[PDB]
Amino acid sequence: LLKRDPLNSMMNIPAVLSRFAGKGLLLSENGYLRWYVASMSIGAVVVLALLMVL
Amino acid sequence: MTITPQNLIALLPLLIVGLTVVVVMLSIAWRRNHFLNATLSVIGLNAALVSLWFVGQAGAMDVTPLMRVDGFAMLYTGLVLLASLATCTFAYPWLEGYNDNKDEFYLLVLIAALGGILLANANHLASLFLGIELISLPLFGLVGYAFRQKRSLEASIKYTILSAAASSFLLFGMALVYAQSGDLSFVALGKNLGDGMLNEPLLLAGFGLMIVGLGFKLSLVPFHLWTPDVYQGAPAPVSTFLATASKIAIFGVVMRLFLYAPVGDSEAIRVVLAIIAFASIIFGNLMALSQTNIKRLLGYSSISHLGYLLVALIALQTGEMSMEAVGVYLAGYLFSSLGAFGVVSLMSSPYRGPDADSLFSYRGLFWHRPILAAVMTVMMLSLAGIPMTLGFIGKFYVLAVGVQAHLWWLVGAVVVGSAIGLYYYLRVAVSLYLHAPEQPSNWQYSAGGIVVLISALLVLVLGVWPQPLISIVRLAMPLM
Amino acid sequence: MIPLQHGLILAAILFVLGLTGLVIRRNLLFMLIGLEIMINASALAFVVAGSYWGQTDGQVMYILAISLAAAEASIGLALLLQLHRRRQNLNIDSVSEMRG
Amino acid sequence: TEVIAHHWAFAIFLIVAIGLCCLMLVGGWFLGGRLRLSAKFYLVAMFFVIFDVEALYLFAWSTSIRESGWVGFVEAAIFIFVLLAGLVYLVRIGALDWTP
Amino acid sequence: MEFAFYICGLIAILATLRVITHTNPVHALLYLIISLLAISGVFFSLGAYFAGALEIIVYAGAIMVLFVFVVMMLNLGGSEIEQERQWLKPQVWIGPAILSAIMLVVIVYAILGVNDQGIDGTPISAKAVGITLFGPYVLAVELASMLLLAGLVVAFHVGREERAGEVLSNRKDDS
Numbered sequence A: 001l002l003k004r005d006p007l008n009s010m011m012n013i014p015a016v017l018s019r020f021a022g023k024g025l026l027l028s029e030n031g032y033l034r035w036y037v038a039s040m041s042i043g044a045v046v047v048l049a050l051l052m053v054l
Numbered sequence B: 001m002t003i004t005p006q007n008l009i010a011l012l013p014l015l016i017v018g019l020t021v022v023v024v025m026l027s028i029a030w031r032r033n034h035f036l037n038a039t040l041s042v043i044g045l046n047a048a049l050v051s052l053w054f055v056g057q058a059g060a061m062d063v064t065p066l067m068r069v070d071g072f073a074m075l076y077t078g079l080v081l082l083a084s085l086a087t088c089t090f091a092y093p094w095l096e097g098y099n100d101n102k103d104e105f106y107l108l109v110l111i112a113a114l115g116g117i118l119l120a121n122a123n124h125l126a127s128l129f130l131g132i133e134l135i136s137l138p139l140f141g142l143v144g145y146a147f148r149q150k151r152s153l154e155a156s157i158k159y160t161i162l163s164a165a166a167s168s169f170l171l172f173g174m175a176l177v178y179a180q181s182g183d184l185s186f187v188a189l190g191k192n193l194g195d196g197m198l199n200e201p202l203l204l205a206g207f208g209l210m211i212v213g214l215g216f217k218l219s220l221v222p223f224h225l226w227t228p229d230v231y232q233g234a235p236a237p238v239s240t241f242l243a244t245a246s247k248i249a250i251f252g253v254v255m256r257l258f259l260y261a262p263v264g265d266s267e268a269i270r271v272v273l274a275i276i277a278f279a280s281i282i283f284g285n286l287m288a289l290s291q292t293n294i295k296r297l298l299g300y301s302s303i304s305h306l307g308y309l310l311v312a313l314i315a316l317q318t319g320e321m322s323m324e325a326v327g328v329y330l331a332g333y334l335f336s337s338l339g340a341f342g343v344v345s346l347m348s349s350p351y352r353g354p355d356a357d358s359l360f361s362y363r364g365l366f367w368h369r370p371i372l373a374a375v376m377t378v379m380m381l382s383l384a385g386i387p388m389t390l391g392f393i394g395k396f397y398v399l400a401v402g403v404q405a406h407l408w409w410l411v412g413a414v415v416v417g418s419a420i421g422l423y424y425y426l427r428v429a430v431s432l433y434l435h436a437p438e439q440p441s442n443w444q445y446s447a448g449g450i451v452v453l454i455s456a457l458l459v460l461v462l463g464v465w466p467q468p469l470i471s472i473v474r475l476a477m478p479l480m
Numbered sequence C: 001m002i003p004l005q006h007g008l009i010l011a012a013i014l015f016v017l018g019l020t021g022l023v024i025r026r027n028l029l030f031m032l033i034g035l036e037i038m039i040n041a042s043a044l045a046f047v048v049a050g051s052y053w054g055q056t057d058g059q060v061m062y063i064l065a066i067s068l069a070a071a072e073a074s075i076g077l078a079l080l081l082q083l084h085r086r087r088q089n090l091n092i093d094s095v096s097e098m099r100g
Numbered sequence D: 001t002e003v004i005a006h007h008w009a010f011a012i013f014l015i016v017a018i019g020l021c022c023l024m025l026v027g028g029w030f031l032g033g034r035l036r037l038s039a040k041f042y043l044v045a046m047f048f049v050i051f052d053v054e055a056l057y058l059f060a061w062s063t064s065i066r067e068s069g070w071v072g073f074v075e076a077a078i079f080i081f082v083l084l085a086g087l088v089y090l091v092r093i094g095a096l097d098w099t100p
Numbered sequence E: 001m002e003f004a005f006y007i008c009g010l011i012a013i014l015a016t017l018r019v020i021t022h023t024n025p026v027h028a029l030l031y032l033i034i035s036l037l038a039i040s041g042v043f044f045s046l047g048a049y050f051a052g053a054l055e056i057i058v059y060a061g062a063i064m065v066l067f068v069f070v071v072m073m074l075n076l077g078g079s080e081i082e083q084e085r086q087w088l089k090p091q092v093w094i095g096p097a098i099l100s101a102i103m104l105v106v107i108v109y110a111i112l113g114v115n116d117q118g119i120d121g122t123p124i125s126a127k128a129v130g131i132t133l134f135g136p137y138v139l140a141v142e143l144a145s146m147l148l149l150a151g152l153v154v155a156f157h158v159g160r161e162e163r164a165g166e167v168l169s170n171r172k173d174d175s
Helices: A006-028 A033-053 B012-030 B034-057 B071-096 B104-120 B125-136 B138-146 B150-180 B201-217 B227-233 B236-260 B269-287 B294-314 B322-347 B370-382 B390-404 B408-431 B443-464 B467-475 C004-024 C028-053 C057-087 D003-030 D040-063 D070-093 E003-020 E025-045 E049-074 E090-111 E126-131 E138-158
Strands: none
Touching: A006 B269, A033 B150, A033 B201, A033 B269, A033 C004, A033 E090, B012 B034, B012 B104, B012 D070, B012 E138, B034 B071, B034 B104, B071 B104, B071 B236, B071 B322, B071 B443, B104 B125, B104 B138, B104 B236, B104 E138, B125 B138, B125 B150, B125 B201, B125 B236, B125 C057, B125 E138, B138 B150, B138 B236, B138 C057, B138 E138, B150 B201, B150 B227, B150 C004, B150 C028, B150 C057, B201 B236, B201 B269, B201 E090, B227 B236, B227 B294, B236 B294, B236 B322, B269 B294, B269 B408, B294 B322, B294 B390, B294 B408, B322 B370, B322 B390, B322 B443, B322 B467, B370 B390, B370 B408, B370 B443, B390 B408, B390 B443, C004 C028, C004 E003, C004 E025, C004 E090, C028 C057, C028 E003, C028 E025, C028 E049, C057 D040, C057 E049, C057 E126, C057 E138, D040 D070, D040 E049, D040 E126, D040 E138, D070 E138, E003 E025, E025 E049, E049 E126
């Protein structure tokens, strides 16, 4: 039952999570300039909202 | 206030760079020569460095309400000047095989060096705005210098539009903080407030819009989406310049703004930059994982390194050594990125026309040019926070600053981001030593070679012995 | 007579409309037009801020703003001309060859 | 009690000038029963724009010529020297001649 | 001069609103011209005579000139883009508009909470701008001259013809 290493698997699911998060985050780099301006506006909204909340 | 004759001594590097700008332009008009203009630009930057030494012989004073010259300004002026020198020495072999005019590149590099010096000396909001715009606007024609090529033109388009948008954001935020506080100086942005009134809405929102603009200019999250396309599309000396000198000057003016203004005691801007630094480190190290192109990977690495700068900046009001840590990490990052982009520029030289695709293919680089592979893997070790390199000294300073003021989340973010980063750093380092599936005698190519190997010797020496760097950084202390 | 809030709200509304026209439109020329709208909005906000305190720094910042607007308009229009001469279209979603 | 009359005179002058042009146009109306131009035109327009914005600094210099001493004259002189260096660079490269 | 300021602001907002949601670009540029005229009137109403005179001299007398010069040069009417009519579709229209309107409401919430001393009189003429333009702010105009020189160099290097002819039909990738 242990010959397929369970603890090595549970210790390299951080690598799987990192690869999944990198592949998910690379969808934002689609190369569209309009989405770049939209993301700039989204970040500005987020920064202003976080400043007004605090 | 008026400018005295003795105040002209502290102005000297800026005057020398402007004089070499007009001298280079007159030489272009008279002759239109490549080697003469490159030599004039190099001589002007070297004379600006000797002028910086002359400034160090003189005092440290406020020249105008726009500019105050001190050790911080001298250090950042020197870093920007040597980065511009490296850009010129990497750009001459690239421009040797260029079909169109090849002197406006040096003119724009000199003007952007002037903008970086202005940002280094910037003690004012107008000075900050003018400095970042003097950095941004020559870089438009620097990125789109190979506008015959498709990707360079696209990168120039993206950079121009997003920089205009972020300049509008910064200008509106600066207008808001001018409407709130009736002085445009750095030191008088919250002097009219007190007794816990400092968290006012207008000043905070204006500083948020300024944070948006400067986070575009420092490739922070989520304003970092311009970074890989601009790094890839632009020519490799342009990528070198807009990675090292532009970002060094913008972070220097950001540090001076957050040090001199009394909004550093505000516990909302600090939390916003903590979130931004956390997300910048984590996100940049995440999207640099599955990258095959070296320029996009270096762009995400730059995103992570400005994240490390930002966490070094958060503890500025408490750690008491944050300026020294930022200076040391910027010296290490400047030399490491200079060496890496110098290898990129030397291997992608000359231009070889716009029809041929300018892919790098770093695999098998050791089997035809071993010295370039050696300096490239030295810089790849340096960017990972790995010892016997100066990048480890900078990472140690950043971690000490983060753990001195008890930034546990940010320290954990730095540790996780470095552990993620060394994966692709050593992947590139191994891949440049593997077997190539498929597959230089000039004086200036050799000049770029000694420049990159001098950078390699510098990072190795200051990794095994960083004490002269600490001595020359601590000697350059701003006036509190 | 005129409160600062109304002028700053007018400048903010112009900035919002310029950003909206910059995002929602695919044409590069209209994108540059929206960029100049946001630049003029920030310049107007600086003018109101300078006129409120009675200082002349707002008008100097307006001069710097319109100098930046002039040079950036020149650069963006040169890039627009090159994009038309090469791609023969001005769709900003068409020039997206750089994937992640 | 004089500048209000002057502003009123300016207002009626503008209003009745546009009204005269409108009534003149509608009285004329009532009675009776893929290519590209060039790039040098854009270049000369951009020369006009950049030199007009530098002329703006000369515009603002001309009003405060006496209140600023010889140091202001030196600063405007090196400004004009940079302007003329740019203009003579433009002259000598060949981008300013037409040659149709 | 307060009702003039309010009406100039209202027609400036209206003119730029017709700028944003227009179809052919020359009418949008005309609407931006009258919007810049209205913002110049706003500048005049607040005592910034130099600012409004500058807006019509520079922003409306040179910059809109460059925009209409390019438009009238390369002969766009918005061809192949008017017939698509992407901006007058709602699934693209709600998103950025409500996002940037959330930005609008949060930034005008940040506008309020500041003490109101009002816009005073004492119109700042060009003499004050001159005496503070070559006093404390010398390096501003010197390095702004350098910045304009850099912008001229960038746009000239990017956007010249490289071909001979005062009438040119469009070739792909310039022959």
